[PDB]
Amino acid sequence: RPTFYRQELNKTIWEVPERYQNLSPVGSGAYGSVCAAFDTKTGLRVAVKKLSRPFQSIIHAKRTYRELRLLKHMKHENVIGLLDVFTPARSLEEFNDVYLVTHLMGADLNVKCQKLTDDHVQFLIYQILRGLKYIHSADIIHRDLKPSNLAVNEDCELKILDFGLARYVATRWYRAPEIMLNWMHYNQTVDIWSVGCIMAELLTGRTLFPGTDHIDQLKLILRLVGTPGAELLKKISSESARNYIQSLTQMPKMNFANVFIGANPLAVDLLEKMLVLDSDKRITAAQALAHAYFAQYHDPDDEPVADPYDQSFESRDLLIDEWKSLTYDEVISFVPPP
Numbered sequence: 590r591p592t593f594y595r596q597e598l599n600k601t602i603w604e605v606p607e608r609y610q611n612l613s614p615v616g617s618g619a620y621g622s623v624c625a626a627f628d629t630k631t632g633l634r635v636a637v638k639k640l641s642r643p644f645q646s647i648i649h650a651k652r653t654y655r656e657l658r659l660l661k662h663m664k665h666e667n668v669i670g671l672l673d674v675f676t677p678a679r680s681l682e683e684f685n686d687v688y689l690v691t692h693l694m695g696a697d698l699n700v701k702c703q704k705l706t707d708d709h710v711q712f713l714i715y716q717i718l719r720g721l722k723y724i725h726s727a728d729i730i731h732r733d734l735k736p737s738n739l740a741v742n743e744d745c746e747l748k749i750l751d752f753g754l755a756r757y758v759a760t761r762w763y764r765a766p767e768i769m770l771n772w773m774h775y776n777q778t779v780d781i782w783s784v785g786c787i788m789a790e791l792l793t794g795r796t797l798f799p800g801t802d803h804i805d806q807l808k809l810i811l812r813l814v815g816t817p818g819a820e821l822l823k824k825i826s827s828e829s830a831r832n833y834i835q836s837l838t839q840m841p842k843m844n845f846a847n848v849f850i851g852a853n854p855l856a857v858d859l860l861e862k863m864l865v866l867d868s869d870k871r872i873t874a875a876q877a878l879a880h881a882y883f884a885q886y887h888d889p890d891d892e893p894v895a896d897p898y899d900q901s902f903e904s905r906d907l908l909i910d911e912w913k914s915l916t917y918d919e920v921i922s923f924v925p926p927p
């Protein structure tokens with residue numbers, strides 16, 4: 590067992606191995622606070638997250654297990670990877686805290702100075718889609734993809750954070766309209782809608798759909814893509830969602846070439862394919878990687894998929910101590926990457 594040391598950060602005690610030095614709070618992460626740290630074993634700058642009350646509720650205990658299982662499985666260059674997982678607990682009976690360690694990277698994609706050049710956008714979006722192809726192949730979706738959960742280093746290398754966890758006092762600028770309207774006729778291309786929103790913002794320097802509330806958000810989306818057509822309306826099972834759509838003014842679809850003036854025509858074409866209201870017609874991550882916009886980056890021989898991922902726990906209703914014991918087993922069996 591390594592030697593641990595205690596300190597107070599964010600009005601709570603952090604107890605970590607001596608290996609992690611100079612803990613500095615860098616704000617909140619998903620379900621916990623994150624500290625930047627120096628890993629003395631590897632010489633790498635890392636992000637250490639202390640999960641908040643991981644086993645103090647059934648929802649928390651199951652999400653703790655969900656997150657650790659996800660992190661232990663996902664092994665891809667454009668997907669955040671688990672460098673370490675630890676607990677100061679010496680036994681299952683004392684197991685109450687979970688800490689997770691990943692690369693820090695340095696910044697996220699989220700005040701703005703300027704637009705990004707076309708090659709910079711190609712590289713960033715390519716990396717996002719390459720990471721999404723991998724995540725989606727494990728039957729995992731982000732569901733809350735946005736600039737703040739895209740971690741980038743000084744060389745513009747990118748890793749997706751906080752996927753597989755999500756399922757009106759906040760802006761939902763990158764959310765697919767089908768998740769917002771609870772249709773709930775949706776698939777993995779909800780993340781492709783978010784990619785489209787991000788790409789558009791990187792190219793123009795402006796938020797594509799900066800809705801002031803849930804109502805205004807949909808209004809801005811429909812102003813660009815047009816109101817749902819007859820083919821799409823037929824596929825909506827929800828009476829509540831269908832009623833909402835009809836109550837809105839009929840908007841024509843805008844030609845994106847007139848919205849993204851001066852942009853690479855191939856970027857405009859890809860945006861048209863990503864920002865389709867009908868999720869059955871929206872481009873997939875794998876299809877988007879093959880689009881001519883990424884000709885300089887695309888390599889079909891190096892866009893890997895995930896190994897089969899056992900997610901059967903998702904259907905289970907277990908007690909807090911059962912989720913805790915399963916999580917503990919995962920912590921003790923963890924093998925760090927080379």
Ligand SMILES: Cc1ccc(C(=O)NC2CC2)cc1NC(=O)c1ccc(-c2ccccc2Cl)s1
Nearest residue numbers: 615618636638689691693696697740750751752
């Ligand atoms: C430490 C950690 C643990 C789990 C997950 C995660 O993605 N979990 C779900 C997949 C299952 C992400 C992180 N990293 C982080 O949360 C951060 C890395 C870099 C961060 C950062 C901090 C400050 C400023 C900019 C950045 Cl990118 S935050």
